[PDB]
Structure 1
Amino acid sequence: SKTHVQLSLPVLQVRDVLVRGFGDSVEEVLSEARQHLKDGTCGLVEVEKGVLPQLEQPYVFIKRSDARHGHVMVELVAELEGIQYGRSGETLGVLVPHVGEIPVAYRKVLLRK
């Protein structure tokens, strides 16, 4: 019922990811990402060169939403064909479904719902 929720997200290496995106439209990927976040079945891939071309568009990014418990404040921004829906701060990673892959870290976030 809150505007923000504390979550700990598993950080996945891109080559381990089994389900490489959330859906087929900007609205769908945002909707599905929010549902997986709520259900604790959302992973995070940190963006490096070569990562994004190995995932499926539209992308869902988590981006830093301000500057000021390790739960960095973030919001969701989708991208399709180089157009972004939402404007925010720096990217912490790209969200993907988590289906039991072994992570390399956990990232604590305070997610704006």
Structure 2
Amino acid sequence: KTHVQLSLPVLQVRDVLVRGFGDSVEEVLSEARQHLKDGTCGLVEVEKGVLPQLEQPYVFIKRSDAAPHGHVMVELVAELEGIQYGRSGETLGVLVPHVGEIPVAYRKVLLRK
């Protein structure tokens, strides 16, 4: 399908054990998409102090519509030293690998695949 319905667990930044997806804009995007397919991708909400606790390159999910079945449509946008690869809307959080951390919530989204 073009879009997948996912429910990502929301992790508090200081609980994340793996804090990036890779070392290049194209690997962080590829793993992110891969862990999304596998249900092993988490979501950290971006607040004051949150991004410097994480490793670049960043992968954000950003909203791309104004939202079916409760799920919000989103797309991936990487970032590395201030340059973003991907134009899209408002950031719903930063993606991270999920490796068992207990979430504080679940953000329902609809991924462009």
Deviation at 1:67, TM superposition (A): 1.0
SS for the counterpart of 2:27 is helix
> 1:52-107 deviations in whole A, cap 9, x for unaligned?
00000000000001115211000000000000000000000000000000000001
TM-score (norm 1): 0.98
Percent sequence identity over aligned pairs: 99
- The count of aligned residue pairs is 112
> 1:17-68 deviations in whole A, cap 9, x for unaligned?
0000000000000000000000000000000000000000000000001115
* Aligned-CA RMSD value: 0.6
SS for the counterpart of 1:18 is coil
Deviation at 1:7, TM superposition (A): 0.2
SS for the counterpart of 2:20 is coil
SS for the counterpart of 2:84 is strand
Deviation at 1:8, TM superposition (A): 0.4
Q: Runs of 4+ in structure 1 displaced over 3 angstroms? A: none
SS for the counterpart of 2:77 is strand
Gaps of 5+ in 1: none
